């Protein structure tokens, strides 16, 4: 045996880092069955843009979870972590107005100048300044310090001059790590050792995920750069994130609305603003999609019911939107600190588990509630308001879902009701879900049929609908009517009627599968 190094350099060897007394190892896996969406507040991220996060990116994208001692800023990341165990999704970040990002400007001689600007604003280069480098990622450099280093390199083959640009990260303790390195040339027509272009803005846009640059065209030609040691970004900060105005929330919701990624669920990740919830419900009803929302968990049983009516969801417009209430407490995963947060992303997990059962059409008839699909996996549950009992009938009348202890011992969601006051077989969760899935399939079929030579035709619209309805019958979503005498044995009826010649009409009826939720036993004695 021989010596063992602690860190790897450029030599060929095997290195072992010192033993770490405390650390956590987390695995990951990717899946794209169903796509969710939402809004929230996080540590770092490009604000007001759609971000795609998977199980292996939700730490790099987004950021390190915020400490619960800060207050009301930790819920969204916990909801995202709970929901991401099934499938990936999309997130839009909302940031307060008093938020700035750092930037360093460079003089013709090469000295740096530090400043910061609001996220909305655009960089304007003062006369006498050659170029500026700023941070594209919405990451303030307060607790982790980011330093920039410049040194010279060999000139180009054609004679152009280029330099090495390096980025480093230093913690509060003093541990220094290396993030990125680049070869950059100020000349417009320059090439890398690999043949790629070395123009600073183009290279930074292409092969860098942290930095961007803006140059002044007039004065770029007669510019010189000298070697500089580590230079740290300053002035970049995030305002008090516990106080977010409704305007930012509405802007994030509007950003979600105009997205082409075609997700299949919308989630309220710890957002307790009524206007934002109503806007999210409007988005949910627009796209024929399911939706899950949550009321504030700290409210007692008595105050929870009016809080459901406070949001505008309770009515006939917003069908297939569920509201939950979870006043219990549990130990946080990252730090065992006894945090309280609601149930959003646990219901979606149950729905995704139900959807994964069937592979042809998805099997949307499975209800989220149940002791098998819906389980709450948390460390230790302690009721916030013991010796208190909810009024179950009032909750049912109020379209509020309840949580109960299962046979095994873990917490279980025991009901699934949508926000529809009328008695239409629609307050059951799956009944709107089947029809929404069928409607989406029909829309996709009709879009493709429009490219046919004839186009949309009544004869053409019947064959495809028969095929899809037969597939849905095969999956078990549609069943025969209960009374064979009154109604025919067929599960669905598709008929076409013609009045005059200008008006046609295509209609199909369906008999949805029922759920089993109330059971009664009657003992006797011989």
């Amino acid at each position: 045996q021989y010596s063992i190094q602690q860190s790897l350099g450029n030599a060929s060897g095997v290195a072992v880092s010192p033993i770490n007394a405390d650390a956590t190892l987390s695995t990951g896996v990717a899946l794209n069955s169903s796509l969710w969406a939402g809004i929230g507040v996080f540590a770092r991220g490009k604000p007001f843009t759609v971000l795609a996060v998977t199980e292996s990116n939700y730490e790099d994208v987004l950021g390190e979870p915020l400490k619960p001692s800060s207050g009301s800023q930790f819920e969204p990341i916990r909801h995202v972590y709970e929901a991401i165990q099934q499938t990936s999704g999309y997130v839009v970040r909302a940031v307060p107005d008093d938020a700035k990002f750092p930037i360093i400007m460079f003089d013709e001689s090469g000295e740096p100048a530090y400043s910061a600007l609001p996220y909305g604003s655009e960089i304007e280069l003062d006369s006498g300044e050659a170029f500026a480098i700023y941070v594209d990622d919405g990451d303030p450099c307060i607790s982790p310090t980011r330093e920039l280093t410049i040194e010279t390199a060999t000139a180009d083959s054609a004679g152009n001059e280029r330099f090495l640009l390096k980025l480093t990260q230093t913690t509060s303790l003093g541990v220094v790590t290396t993030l990125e390195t680049h070869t950059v040339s100020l000349a417009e027509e320059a090439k890398d050792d690999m043949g790629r272009l070395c123009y600073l803005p183009t290279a930074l846009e292409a092969r860098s995920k942290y930095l961007r640059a803006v140059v002044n065209e007039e004065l770029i030609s007669t510019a010189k750069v000298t070697n500089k040691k580590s230079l740290a970004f300053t002035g970049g900060t995030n305002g008090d994130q516990s106080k977010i105005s409704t305007a930012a929330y509405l802007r994030a919701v509007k950003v979600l609305n105009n997205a082409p990624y075609m997700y299949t669920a919308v989630l309220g990740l710890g957002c307790y603003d009524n206007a934002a919830i109503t806007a999210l419900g409007k988005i949910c009803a627009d796209r024929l999609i399911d939706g899950f929302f949550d009321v504030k968990p700290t409210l007692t049983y008595a105050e929870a019911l009016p809080a459901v009516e406070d949001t505008g969801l309770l009515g006939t417009d917003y069908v297939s939107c569920s509201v939950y209430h979870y006043p219990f407490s549990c130990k946080d995963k990252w730090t065992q600190s006894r945090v309280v947060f609601g149930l959003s992303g646990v219901a979606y997990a149950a729905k995704a588990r139900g959807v994964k059962k069937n592979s042809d059409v998805g099997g949307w008839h499975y209800s989220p509630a149940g002791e098998e699909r819906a389980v709450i996996a948390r460390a230790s549950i302690q009721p916030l308001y013991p010796e208190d009992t909810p009024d179950e009938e009032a909750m049912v009348k109020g379209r509020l879902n309840k949580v109960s202890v299962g046979t095994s011992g873990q917490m279980i969601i025991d009901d699934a009701l949508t926000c529809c006051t009328q008695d239409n077989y629609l307050h059951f969760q799956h009944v709107p879900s089947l029809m929404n899935a069928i409607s989406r399939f029909f829309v996709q079929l009709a879009r493709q049929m429009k490219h046919s030579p004839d186009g949309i035709t009544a004869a053409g619209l019947t064959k495809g609908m028969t095929k899809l309805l037969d597939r849905f019958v095969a999956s078990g979503a549609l069943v025969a009517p209960r009374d064979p005498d009154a109604d025919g044995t067929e599960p669905y009826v598709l008929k076409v009627t013609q009045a005059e010649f200008d008006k046609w009409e295509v209609v199909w009826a369906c008999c949805p599968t029922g759920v089993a939720r109330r059971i009664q036993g009657v003992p006797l004695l011989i």
Partner: protein, 167 residues
């Protein structure tokens, strides 16, 4: 002649749609063996198998003649028959000679690689259809040579004994 005959093609159509609802049927010609560190022999395999996947059974006769069969311990070790083709450079013979010369245990991975589930020129495997065997011993059988078999190619028969099945 028969008074119970009655036709119903909606039921048959429903059965057809239900059967066709599932994706495909795996053709028996699509598989791959790995052989751990000797990955150059994977091309020459021509026949393989999946382990038994059974348990021992315990029989107990109760009162009167009542009998019950009960689950027993898992069966670990078994045999697998593998056939390979032979080239004019003695790849299979050299492999068998090396394996006999030095006592070794080789890990063998069997997986199904259909054409439908593939990206580019590289096959992609699925966890559901992948099985593994550890601590295997590779043995040979007698190899038959004969004239008047001008239309045939020599095919050694290999016998592999595994000691653990993992998935």
């Amino acid at each position: 002649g028969h008074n119970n005959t009655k036709g119903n093609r909606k039921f048959i159509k429903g059965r057809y749609t239900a059967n066709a609802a599932k994706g495909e049927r795996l053709v028996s010609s699509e598989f791959l063996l790995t052989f751990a560190g000797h990955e150059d022999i994977s091309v020459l395999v021509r026949t393989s198998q999946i382990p038994e996947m059974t348990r021992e059974d315990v029989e107990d006769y109760g009162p009167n003649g009542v009998k019950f069969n009960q689950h027993g311990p898992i069966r670990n070790s078994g045999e697998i028959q593998v056939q390979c083709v032979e080239t004019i450079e003695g790849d299979i013979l050299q492999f068998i000679k090396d394996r006999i010369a030095a006592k070794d245990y080789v890990d063998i991975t069997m997986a199904a690689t259909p054409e439908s589930k593939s990206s580019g020129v590289n096959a992609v495997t699925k966890a559901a259809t992948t099985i593994e065997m550890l601590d295997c011993k590779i043995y040979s059988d007698a190899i038959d040579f004969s004239t008047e078999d001008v239309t045939a190619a020599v095919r050694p028969s290999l016998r592999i004994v595994y000691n653990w099945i993992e998935w």
